[PDB]
Amino acid sequence: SMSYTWTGALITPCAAEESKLPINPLSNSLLRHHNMVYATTSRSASLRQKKVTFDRLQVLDDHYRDVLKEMKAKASTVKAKLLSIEEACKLTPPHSAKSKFGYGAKDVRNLSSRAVNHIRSVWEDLLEDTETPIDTTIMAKSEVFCVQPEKGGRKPARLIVFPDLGVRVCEKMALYDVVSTLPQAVMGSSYGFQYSPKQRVEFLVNTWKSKKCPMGFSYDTRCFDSTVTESDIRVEESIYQCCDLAPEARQAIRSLTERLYIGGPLTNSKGQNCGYRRCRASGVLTTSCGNTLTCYLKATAACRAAKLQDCTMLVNGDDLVVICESAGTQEDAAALRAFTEAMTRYSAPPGDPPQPEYDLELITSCSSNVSVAHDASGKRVYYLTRDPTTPLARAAWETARHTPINSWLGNIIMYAPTLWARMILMTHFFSILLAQEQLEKALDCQIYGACYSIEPLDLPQIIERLHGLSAFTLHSYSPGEINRVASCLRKLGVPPLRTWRHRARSVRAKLLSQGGRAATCGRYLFNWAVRTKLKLTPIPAASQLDLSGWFVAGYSGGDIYHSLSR
Ligand SMILES: O=c1ccn([C@@H]2O[C@H](COP(=O)(O)OP(=O)(O)OP(=O)(O)O)[C@@H](O)[C@H]2O)c(=O)[nH]1
Ligand SMILES: [Mn+2]
Ligand SMILES: [Mn+2]
């Protein structure tokens, strides 16, 4: 079975597309080499299709079935709720793509009669029609990155596939509770999205330490969605089916599984049939959960086949990292060879062969890695970092062009503890906000795939709640880590780290002599920039009325929104 079949019609864009970074009178303050930044467009959709299109051979053995059951027994433990039309409407983001039936996200969240009437029929249809493939739209995703060291090396557009708005709301009523609860229940501490960065770190380390002689690695499959089979999707459904569900929920899931999740026809923006999918759809509510479960299921089985000792995994979508007891170098190399031979068999071959690692700071996953620093008292603190090239490039692009979702904000949140996050991002953006007094204007950013509405003035609280205070006092980052950041600044033409020490004192000052919420931002966010450092006390309101539901589950491509946590 082929992951895709193409009729020749083009993946077309729904609007015009900006691909280059125009000469900015403020972004150059950030990055000077504009020709290094680029956003993906329809033009490269075909290169993507070729990467994404191939036959799938899958062989399932005893360990796989053994693991399936263990997972199912756990899922058996869950009672999932049917979400009401209203609840699901609220979960829809304000700029979620509009329906082909004459209403948009706004209409849906406002509970328009037209919108709710269509949703109801889409739901009724889920109960009356058990087999007709549901229409999906295929588009090229616009994403900004830095040119490849191979000079002019570019990533082709990634393809996004999703059903009409109406179906999406139905998916929510039918599966939102499930997709928010089953992953943990089934994978325990192995489910990654349940952890804030601070927790993901605690869990990696306490695990690494828990080993007499630790050996670890990260695994990532070559274009995972395409590797997901119809079989894999039905197994996924067998897992969902073990929950106690309402009758209509149970049929909605069952119908959604055959009509949408296993495959369906592909339609472009001009309304033409581009082909057919027989693999995971990037834009359905189940794709995060589905991928984690499938990833976890295959990997657990692979461990037992490769006979790895005391394996402990952490899974996020298709992002896998396993920490086991080293059984000797030579030994370890053969185990990963086997592990991979098994993953490949289960229909999930690697992008790059996994390398056994013996230094936790050396294992990278989710595009991130753990690093060490020291706090106020110099007590070796641990945190999560990542190469800053893509983040800095995106910050650049978001500066020259108001985009709907502001990744820089998100990166500050998740990476607040980091060197680059504090010294460049925090500095750059707080002066831009200062200038236009956009401190109060809330922005949309996403975490683990769900879009969140956030007020910059609340970063101290948020940062404090998530990383602790050490996030405001880390000071002796690793050589390795500092070298990476500097090397990257050179690559992008971003002014060296010390140039930023300067900029911050200013911004901060212009933030202390501002009072209120703005002022606090000034005291806590740039304490690394002032000569005369003060002693930061736990923020009152922060570790208080600060909302949650933030690190419960992944919703990438799931059309999820929350306007909580100020
Ligand atoms: O919302 C989405 C979209 C995509 N995917 C799928 O999960 C994988 C996570 O993508 P990766 O970071 O693994 O990149 P890759 O090397 O596997 O594939 P290239 O993207 O760089 O082409 C993607 O490659 C995609 O196929 C999801 O799981 N969820
Ligand atoms: Mn992948
Ligand atoms: Mn990945």
**Domain identity same for 175 and 204:** yes
Tokens found for residue 533: 């450092």
| Residues, CB-to-ion distance under 5 Å, ligand 3 | 318-319
The answer to whether the Cα torsion of 1, 132, 262, 139 is positive or negative is positive
- For residue 404, what are the domain limits? 368-566
Quick one: how far is CA 536 from the chain centroid?
32
DSSP-assigned letter for residue 404: S
**Domain identity same for 376 and 324:** no
**Domain identity same for 72 and 218:** yes
User: Binding residue per annotation — 319?
Assistant: yes
Quick one: how far is CA 241 from the chain centroid?
26
SS3 277: strand
Experimental technique of record: X-ray
Q: Ligand 1: which of 225, 280, 320 to mutate, most ligand atoms within 8 Å of CB? A: 225
User: Which H helix or E strand runs over 511?
Assistant: helix 497-512
Given a contact cutoff of 8 angstroms between Cβ atoms, the answer to whether 309 and 211 are in contact is: no
Given a contact cutoff of 8 angstroms between Cβ atoms, the answer to whether 4 and 280 are in contact is: no
Q: How far apart are CA 538 and CA 202, in angstroms?
A: 21
Tokens found for residue 362: 């050396």
CA of 255 to the centre of ligand 1 (A): 26
Domains identified in the chain, total number: 2
CA of 317 to the centre of ligand 3 (A): 7
13 to 143, 193, 237, 557: CA distances (angstroms): 14, 32, 33, 18
**Domain identity same for 345 and 407:** no
> What are the residue ranges of helices labelled H in 422-478?
427-436, 459-467
**Domain identity same for 353 and 374:** no
**Domain identity same for 358 and 372:** no
85 contact partners, CB below 8 Å, separation of at least 6? 111, 116, 119, 120, 169, 173
**Domain identity same for 139 and 191:** yes
204 to 116, 416, 482: CA distances (angstroms): 45, 19, 22
**Domain identity same for 224 and 103:** yes
410 to 319, 401, 449, 454, 542: CA distances (angstroms): 19, 17, 11, 10, 18
**Domain identity same for 412 and 302:** no
CA of 279 to the centre of ligand 1 (A): 13
User: Binding residue per annotation — 375?
Assistant: no
User: Binding residue per annotation — 458?
Assistant: no
